[PDB]
């Protein structure tokens, strides 16, 4: 049909955000190490329909936070955004593009395929500048937000300096079963506990 | 330099903007859009609002200056001074732009993000010919009541829109920095739509 079509991959913003501030960063890096949350990130961004592959799209600084031994993130099309990029694909298969608009156009011309595999989902994986722009892009279909809560001792609280500029009243939180349907995986329900943190996996779609 | 916008709400197709020193309609959500847009700035930045002397006088004194924004008022009779509240009383757009630039486009150590020209008709009709204006933010207002109740207006834009081109909605949102309703909004006997325009070239 013409409503909620399938002519391009769905686009998700996926982030882990500290409540209530939507804090995401401290001194240029991630303020917590949540082992199972990072497993969820890998599992979700890698899970694709048979014979498909997903993309991960990120700002240049977030790319630079990934240890070199991890690059490019395995099993996914990696796209890096930098204003001076030349919209080229390098010898490692990494896409270096100058805007989200430019990479979306290039993928469409290639039939949303990457090395003879169709794309399933496109995930925007950070960082702050990219999230603050793309929350306004009408093409974004949903948010995958891990809501992170610090429950430890006051001395151990994370010292945050970077926050999402997102208006969640423009979005609506979905039922857990809808999250599972979208990501293609069984997902823990409710609060998960690790160390000094609790966290919950959530999915949001546009309001109204 | 900061980008410069003319921001206006105008009745279609006459481009009427006022009647007897007030707006011809009472649209609470449209006024909130104006407030949200003109106040939305990058962290540590501030926006300016530039207006003619007569529109300044229409703001109730208790609400002057418009909070959270650098207020500039144009009157041929101003001495180019900054008052105790930080209000810029300037004699021309020229003079205030040259002063802001000599200050590195900063106000109290905050860089200017955007400069908004907020009316009224005399300022709009002059400044739409100023090469420094980058875009128009036009709320297109439509009267949708009965013919017997159609509004009277006394003040109008004189704009040649053939010199401008309307942008897609996502470009409006990116510029103003906010998620903005698309298409026609309804309040009472009026519908209205938020639009953005750049120079046609
Ligand atoms: N889930 C979480 O909690 C996450 C948190 N983060 C946090 O985010 C922070 C880093 O965010 P940030 O510093 O904003 O860096 P980003 O990862 O957003 O990369 C910023 C760079 O992206 C490029 N860029 C920005 N806007 C555009 C554009 N419109 N078009 C093209 N390229 C663009 C520029 O690269 P150039 O300068 O080369 O032009 C800019 O310097 C860190 O604290 C990190 O920990 C990161 C990911 C997820
Ligand atoms: N719908 C909308 O979006 C808006 C509607 N309005 C409506 O517009 C009407 C008011 O508009 P208008 O009557 O045109 O008044 P303006 O707000 O344009 O103020 C006109 C005054 O601006 C000063 N001025 C004009 N040209 C110059 C210049 N070249 N250099 C310096 N100063 C200058 C003069 O002040 P002096 O005489 O002191 O020199 C002049 O009297 C009202 O009905 C109001 O409600 C107002 C704003 C927006
Ligand atoms: C925080 C984490 C691990 N979890 C999550 N839910 N969303 C995102 N984007 N995440 C992330 C992924 C890759 C990079 Cl390089 C930086 C941060
Ligand atoms: C690659 C990812 C998500 N997966 C993993 N297993 N370990 C780490 N450190 N990871 C990471 C996390 C945050 C940032 Cl900012 C950059 C890379
Ligand atoms: C009409 C309104 C509220 N909405 C809009 N879109 N543009 C402008 N300039 N507006 C306005 C703002 C302040 C003043 Cl004092 C007079 C009119
Ligand atoms: C600027 C604004 C919205 N803010 C406020 N607090 N009160 C009033 N009257 N305002 C107003 C509305 C229309 C016109 Cl023509 C002039 C000023």
Numbering used by the authors:
A (entry chain A): -4 to 203
B (entry chain B): 3 to 203
Task: Reproduce passages from the article.
In order to reveal the binding modes of PYR and CYG, we obtained the ternary complexes CauDHFR–NADPH–PYR and CauDHDFR–NADPH–CYG. Interestingly, two CYG molecules are clearly observed as electron density in the DHF binding site of CauDHFR (named CYG1 and CYG2 here). CYG1 binds in an almost identical manner to PYR, but a secondary CYG2 also binds within the active site. For CYG2, the pyrimidine region interacts with the positively charged lip region, which is classically occupied by glutamate moieties, and the phenyl group occupies the apolar region that is classically occupied by the PABA moiety, stacked above the first CYG compound. The ternary complex with CYG only has slight conformational differences compared with the ternary complex with PYR, except for Phe65, which moves by 2.6 Å. This is most likely to be due to the steric clash that would arise in the ternary complex with CYG if it was in the same position as in the ternary complex with PYR. The Leu60 residue is shifted towards the NADPH molecule in both ternary complexes, being shifted 1.4 and 2.1 Å from the apoenzyme and holo­enzyme, respectively, with respect to CauDHFR–NADPH–PYR and 1.1 and 1.6 Å, respectively, with respect to CauDHFR–NADPH–CYG. The exception to this trend was CYG, with a significantly lower IC50 than would be expected from the thermal shift at 401 µM. This is a surprising result due to its largely similar crystal structure when compared with the CauDHFR–NADPH–PYR complex.
